Amino acid sequence: YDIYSRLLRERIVCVMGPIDDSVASLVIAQLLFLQSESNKKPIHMYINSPGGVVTAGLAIYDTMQYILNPICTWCVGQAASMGSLLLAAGTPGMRHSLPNSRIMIHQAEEIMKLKKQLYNIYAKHTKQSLQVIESAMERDRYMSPMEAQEFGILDKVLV
Amino acid sequence: IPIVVAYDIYSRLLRERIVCVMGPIDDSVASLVIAQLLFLQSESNKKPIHMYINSPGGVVTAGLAIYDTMQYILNPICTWCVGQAASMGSLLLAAGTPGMRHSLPNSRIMIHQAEEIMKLKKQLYNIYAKHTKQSLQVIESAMERDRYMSPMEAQEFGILDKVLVHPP
Amino acid sequence: LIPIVYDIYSRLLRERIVCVMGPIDDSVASLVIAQLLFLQSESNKKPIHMYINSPGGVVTAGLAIYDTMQYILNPICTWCVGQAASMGSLLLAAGTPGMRHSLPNSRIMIHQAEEIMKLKKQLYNIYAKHTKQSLQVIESAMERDRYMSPMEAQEFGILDKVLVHPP
Amino acid sequence: DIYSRLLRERIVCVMGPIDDSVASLVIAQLLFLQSESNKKPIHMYINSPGGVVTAGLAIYDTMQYILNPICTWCVGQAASMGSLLLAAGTPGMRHSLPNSRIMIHQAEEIMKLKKQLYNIYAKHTKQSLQVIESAMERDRYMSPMEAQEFGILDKVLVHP
Amino acid sequence: LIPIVVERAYDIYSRLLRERIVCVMGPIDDSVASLVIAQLLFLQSESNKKPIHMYINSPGGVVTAGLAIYDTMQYILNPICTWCVGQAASMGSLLLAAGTPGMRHSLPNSRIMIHQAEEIMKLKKQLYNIYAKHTKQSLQVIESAMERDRYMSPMEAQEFGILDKVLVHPP
Amino acid sequence: DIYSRLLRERIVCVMGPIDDSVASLVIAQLLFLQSESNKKPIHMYINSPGGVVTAGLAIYDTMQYILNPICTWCVGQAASMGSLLLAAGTPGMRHSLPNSRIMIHQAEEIMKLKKQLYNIYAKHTKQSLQVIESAMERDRYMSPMEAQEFGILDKVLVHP
Amino acid sequence: RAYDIYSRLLRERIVCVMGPIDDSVASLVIAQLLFLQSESNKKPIHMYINSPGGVVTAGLAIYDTMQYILNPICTWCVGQAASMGSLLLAAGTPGMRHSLPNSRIMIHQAEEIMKLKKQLYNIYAKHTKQSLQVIESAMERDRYMSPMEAQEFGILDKVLVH
């Protein structure tokens, strides 16, 4: 057992380092395998992502929403734009984050269309309207997890 | 890369009859996927295979190689789209057992891609028509247009069979 | 990389399925000939399947594979997958007459000091021995650089049968 | 692996520059060892020229999350985030061998980022904010004996 | 990568060593010389009389590495069975001729060539003498023929004395 | 593996540069061998052109904390930090082969670190600090016989 | 392939020193040498040399280990032995330094270079029985010596013409 494999036995899936197509392949593979291992038990996902490809991160967001396990997401260190989506996509009520975490939401025409999809999915999961998020995506700033608990991304900031 | 107990994670999923086609379609990916399928079809003549696509494109002859073997295998084939199925990916996506080319709601799909390339394009046209039922000039118009499509819109063109907003 | 427990190619090798995929170089020539001589060691009458997907290759490595294929008594079924270009077509042609197959969309193509023109006569000669067409016929085919469909490969004798679904 | 045989005896070797890759290994060993037991401590060997700021924080809050006592041994150089991790050891159990060197030194999020480091240093070293603010600004490696009066180490060890 | 056929599982090359087959394939190097020399020493320890088959496909290589292989080939008391496949050019031709007489072989379709710091001369003068010993040709025929740059058919090499049989089937 | 076969026999090979990477392994191997036996000798073989000072200092620190007698064998050259390791063998069992090549030669912070090097040589070579000053200034490798009179070695052996 | 047949060759006490002598090769060679002495203090060791020389301070580390050991060392030059590699060839036990019929041998390779040059001369002089004057003159010359020239020089004892 590699420690990553030992962790996977306890249904802990890491996402750390920039989300590329290869990390997505491993994360999707583990998730599908963890679903077939159990259609009931939770899965824990640890997010430390400085960034990610939009179509890669969208594939993981799809897979998480279209899987029947409860997904608990933990912010360790930083969840940049693509990671903040994946954090906010964990099952509502079970999105934890560590005290000194850093969250950032901010990121031709097809890119605007996909960016429009991101606006819509962020509005659903954080339960803000479209216009609130339209401004909050525009501001290129990190935020502390206490502000993110109020903004609606996190549920409980864990110390 | 994770291990599971000693199978690699992919080696475990291959037991669940799942073929991961990700990344560019190249000779190695085709060689590996063709070989995977030959094995899986030797384990059963009837059990549906699941092929999961996230691919930006690839070599035209490589995608045709997987397409050919997909036709020759007797098993049913679920073809799922996670992320994107561009260029040759859309042919592999279209090539599943008609009626069960499933997909995931936020995917993005793109059919768009001397005389060898021209004659070869007239082959892609015919095979898209057989799976998507469309007419040849319609395909040539759509293929000529370079813009992503949605899984709702993809199902209206016929490439996808069912978007799943969740497991049913 | 490769699905392992005893990767898939060792697993395919066990059923006498010998891949030649990617270009034919001396490195792959060394491996392919070794597999053949092993498979002849375990059983001599039984079939061997060779799957060819090659864009081309170094002429002297393919020739090494070619006369190795001739040397063994096994019937060698060749399967053309995506490409049999240049030497791949010659390796495809080397199968036991009747058993050189293609998938319905593969592209087959035979176009390629003093030794190179002498090497080409050998290529002329060896294509002719396997395709039964005349010598000037083969010199006319390879002078023009074009890919040709599997239906045409049947009439030229390179294939014997294109298989959409098994009989 | 001599490294994996040191994991059986509850030793985590944070050596080399701190990066997200080093962070993934380190936090994973820590979470595993807590699952093994909640009583026996974790021995942490720090030797790091430098570190990604958010990586070192990810170790620290993982450090402070676990119920284990964490024995922190500096060997060689514990610098920048390595000094946060060196301070991050449980109070009463921060060690060094006598030849080591230590350095605390290191867009509004950068300002808030540097600010949150001040608070954590103040919590564990118990020095006031102005003391730590000036000290981090001083680009100077400190000797362990200076670090010990500054409070970062409980014990400097000569021939234990 | 190499197909791992199971038996403990051997590489396909390790399987062929069991059958006493040494694959000298690719450009001859100091590393290939070490690999090939070690295999030959192990094979004599394996059997003091049973033959050793050497498959040669070498575009050439460093002469001082080729000679190191050839020297052990001469030293080893077992019969050696040198098969040309593909090509045996420059130093690979010397090993092709280094097998026991009447047992050096060539596939019907191989291409063979004997054409290749003043040691370059004294060593080249060495190569002529070893070619003279093994091909049974005189020194002058070798001197003039080695300067000709041209691959030779297996029939021409047969009549030169390098190889003893070109066949189509094992019989 | 051959190197781990030597570890079974209590041999630790500092072969090549003393870099952060190799210091981590040698420290780890040393801690292991202290646990295997609390009394049996530990043998060290040195062939080092040099390395980074802070990593060599981490090796020296551990060698001093390990209780056991450390036999330092010079095999090849011991340049810069390797000679400090060689001089840090427990007195009475610092050895070298006849044809070995030995070399002690090497901002404010480098000065401070280099002032540390002086004393650690001084207390092990039994030389006055001004003497270490002059003999650490000259860029010249010295024979094992010359090193014995300076104070680095104890025996220059030709056969055991 | 490379490193398990050599593990087999370690079994019958053959140490392959091939490729340029670098400290990694030198450190592995001495590690094998001490290990083989640890197996038996009296049995022979076979050394196979094909090296286009290498780094002098590590070749002296190899050379010093060879004079250290109790087991007799037999050096078999194959191919070419150059520079520092020729020092290993000379340093086998007198009476056990051999070569193939057509190997090639060469003895040619700050104050440290000058001092290193002097001590190499003593080693060659001790094991080859020449005068230091002969070694100076013979070490300047760049030429490779034939095996028969090397036997008469005294570097080697016997050539395996048989």
Instruction: For residue B52, give both structure tokens.
Output: 């999961």
On the 0-12 / 13-18 / 19+ scale of CB atoms within 10 A, G18 is buried
Phi, psi dihedral angles at C102 (to 5 degrees): -135, 150
Q: What is the DSSP string of chain B?
A: --EE--EEHHHHHHHTTEEEEES-B-HHHHHHHHHHHHHHHHH-SSSPEEEEEEE--B-HHHHHHHHHHHHH--S-EEEEEEEEEETHHHHHHHTS-TT--EE-TT-EEE----HHHHHHHHHHHHHHHHHH---HHHHHHHHHS---B-HHHHHHHTS-SEE-SS--
User: CB distance A76–D55 less than 8 Å?
Assistant: no
Q: What is the DSSP string of C13-40?
A: HHTTEEEEES-B-HHHHHHHHHHHHHHH
Distances (CA, A) of G52 to B132, G18, G102, G104, G127: 67, 8, 16, 10, 21
Q: What share of chain A is helix, strand, coil (3-state, %, to 5)?
A: 50, 20, 30
Enumerate residues 6+ apart whose C-beta is below 8 A from F1. none
Candidates F20, F53, F114, F117, partner chain D, best to mutate (most D CBs within 10 A): F20
Q: Are B71 and C164 in contact (CB under 8 A)?
A: yes
Domains of chain D (ranges, CATH numbers) = 2-156 (3.90.226.10)
Nearest to F23 by CA among D8, D56, D97: D97
Q: How far is G67 from chain E (nearest CA, A)?
A: 25
Residue with tokens 């060197």: D101
Enumerate residues 6+ apart whose C-beta is below 8 A from D121. D84, D87, D104, D127, D132, D136
Enclosing H/E stretch for F111: helix F108-125
Instruction: For residue C74, give both structure tokens.
Output: 């096994």
What is the rounded end-to-end Cα distance, in angstroms, of chain A? Answer: 30
Q: Are B24 and A21 in contact (CB under 8 A)?
A: no
Q: Cβ contacts (< 8 Å) between B22 and chain C: which residues?
A: none
Nearest to E119 by CA among G106, G140, G18: G106
User: CB distance A16–D25 less than 8 Å?
Assistant: no
Q: What is the DSSP letter of C44?
A: S
Resolution of the coordinates, Å: 3.7
Distances (CA, A) of E45 to A103, G11, G161: 68, 12, 21
Is F105 part of the annotated catalytic residue set? yes
Q: What is d(CA E42, CA G6) in angstroms, rounded to the nearest whole number?
A: 10
Q: What is d(CA B121, CA A119) in angstroms, rounded to the nearest whole number?
A: 38
Q: What is d(CA C93, CA B111) in angstroms, rounded to the nearest whole number?
A: 35
User: From the candidates B55, B87, B90, B107, which is the catalytic residue?
Assistant: B87
Q: What is the DSSP string of A59-92?
A: HHHHHHHTSSS-EEEEEEEEE-HHHHHHHHTSPT
Q: Report the length, in residues, of chain B.
A: 168
Three-class secondary structure of residue F62 per DSSP: helix
Q: What is d(CA D74, CA D103) in angstroms, rounded to the nearest whole number?
A: 12
Three-class secondary structure of residue F114 per DSSP: helix
User: CB distance A8–B10 less than 8 Å?
Assistant: no
Residue with tokens 């060892």: D33
User: CB distance E34–G14 less than 8 Å?
Assistant: no
Q: Are D51 and D26 in contact (CB under 8 A)?
A: no
User: CB distance F75–G67 less than 8 Å?
Assistant: no
Candidates C16, C105, C145, C161, partner chain B, best to mutate (most B CBs within 10 A): C105
Instruction: For residue F6, give both structure tokens.
Output: 């030597």
The angle that helices D53-65 and D81-88 make with each other, rounded to 10 degrees, is: 10
Q: Where are the beta strands (DSSP E) in C8-164?
A: 17-21, 48-54, 76-85, 100-102, 107-109, 161-162
Of G16, G19, G79, the CB nearest to E64: G79
Three-class secondary structure of residue D80 per DSSP: coil
Nearest to G12 by CA among B82, B157, A119, E38: E38
Question: F6-16: buried (b, 16+ CB within 10 Å) or exposed (e) per residue?
Answer: bbeebbbbbbb
Q: What is the DSSP letter of D8?
A: T
For chains B and C, what is the number of CB pairs under 8 angstroms? 75
Q: What is the DSSP letter of C164?
A: S
Q: What is d(CA G79, CA G62) in angstroms, rounded to the nearest whole number?
A: 20
User: CB distance G100–E38 less than 8 Å?
Assistant: no
Three-class secondary structure of residue E55 per DSSP: strand
Q: What is d(CA C66, CA C38) in angstroms, rounded to the nearest whole number?
A: 16
Of D13, D101, D140, the CB nearest to F28: D13
Nearest to A54 by CA among A25, A79, A21: A21
Candidates B15, B20, B51, B106, partner chain A, best to mutate (most A CBs within 10 A): B106
User: CB distance B164–A65 less than 8 Å?
Assistant: no
Beta-carbon count within 10 A of B133 CB: 10
Nearest to G1 by CA among F134, A141, C30, C18: C30
Of F20, F29, F120, the CB nearest to D15: F20
Using an 8 Å CB-CB cutoff, list residues of chain E that contact chain G.
11, 13-14, 30-31, 33-35, 37-39, 41-42, 45, 64-65, 67-68, 71-72, 74-75, 119, 122-123, 126, 130
Three-class secondary structure of residue D65 per DSSP: helix
Strand-pair category, G104-106 with G97-99: unpaired
Q: How far is F44 from chain D (nearest CA, A)?
A: 17
Q: Are D94 and D87 in contact (CB under 8 A)?
A: yes
Of D2, D13, D16, the CB nearest to F32: D2
Q: What share of chain G is helix, strand, coil (3-state, %, to 5)?
A: 50, 20, 30
Q: Strand pairing partners for F14?
A: F46
What is the rounded end-to-end Cα distance, in angstroms, of chain G? Answer: 31
Distances (CA, A) of G118 to B54, E4, F96, G135: 68, 53, 20, 10
Q: Cβ contacts (< 8 Å) between D5 and chain F: which residues?
A: 32
Beta-carbon count within 10 A of C43 CB: 11
Beta-carbon count within 10 A of E140 CB: 10
Q: What is d(CA B124, CA E123) in angstroms, rounded to the nearest whole number?
A: 61
Q: Are E100 and E79 in contact (CB under 8 A)?
A: yes
Nearest to B106 by CA among D94, A64, C29: A64
- The upper half-sphere exposure of residue A5, i.e. CA atoms within 13 Å in the direction of its Cβ, equals 12
Three-class secondary structure of residue F72 per DSSP: strand
